[model samples]
Target: MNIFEMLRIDEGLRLKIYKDTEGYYTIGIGHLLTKSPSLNAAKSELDKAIGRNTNGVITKDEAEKLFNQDVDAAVRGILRNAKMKPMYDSMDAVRRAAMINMVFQMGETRMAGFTNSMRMMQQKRWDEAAVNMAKSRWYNQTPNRAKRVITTMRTGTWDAYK
Candidate 1:
């Protein structure tokens, strides 16, 4: 099969929009819709493309468009927000990207709660930051990802130190 077909299956598989395991509104394979889409707005957008949101389907092109919109908002929102901007600037490139992705995976508010880890990170305390991250209850839930993220923050083997 072509790369496009392979990539789509890799993302996830569903015929149309549905709620994901996290209860977020999702659509067209892996596209997570805005978590809090107003009924009015859902109706408006779904109305345009599919006549209704539920029990309706969209093309790969539409899914790609929607995916770009959702993830773009996540990236843009985090970058624009005052709280995250400095933190973004503070970290090494690899760590910053992982933290932002973690923020998206969890959330800005929840990630902000990582006080000690953030503190360590701000101070450029790499090992301490990794230790602090390991100390979290969040670490329990997503240990594998946590390991990779912390490893990126600490060593940056793939990236040189500043």
Candidate 2:
């Protein structure tokens, strides 16, 4: 057997998460899950780890592992996009966080397709970018969050989060 299989035989890797006998979150074989690195990574790694399971529970420790891997990947993905580089320096923390959240949600490649919003954002057309954000699929499910992000983008303040 391959090294991966041999390791799996010992470590118990699973494709899905589950709960342990103690009702804690578990997934991918005997793997355990826990709190979000978002608690926070400042990078908001926990943002992706939240709501990670339907059938199983995640422990904080396991979530750390999940975010350490998955959240770091999302962050790496965000950093790799050249389009992001074009305007990244222009964005403030709150607005940047909003952008990072979207990257985590849809990923870097998917976000690259949003030329209008990205362009407006780079130009400091705050209101215009907010307008475009309102019509997105992400906004559709979470209008309140969209509004806050829009407000932050417009003003560059974290007041909304407070």
**Residues 1-162, model 2: lDDT tens digits:** 321222233234444454434444445433334433321232232234454433344454664465455445655776776767656556766666666556654567667666788788888887787788778765676566556656766787766656
Q: Worst lDDT window (10 residues) for model 2?
A: 37-46
lDDT per residue (tens digit) for residues 28-116 in model 1: 64555546545444435554544454434677666666555545655676788788777777776666656655665566777777767
Q: How high is each candidate's TM-score? A: 0.61, 0.60
Off by over 4 Å in 1: 1-63, 157-162
lDDT (C-alpha) at residue 1 in model 2: 30
C-alpha RMSD by candidate, in order? 6.4, 13.8
Clashing residue pair totals per candidate (backbone < 3 A) = 0, 13
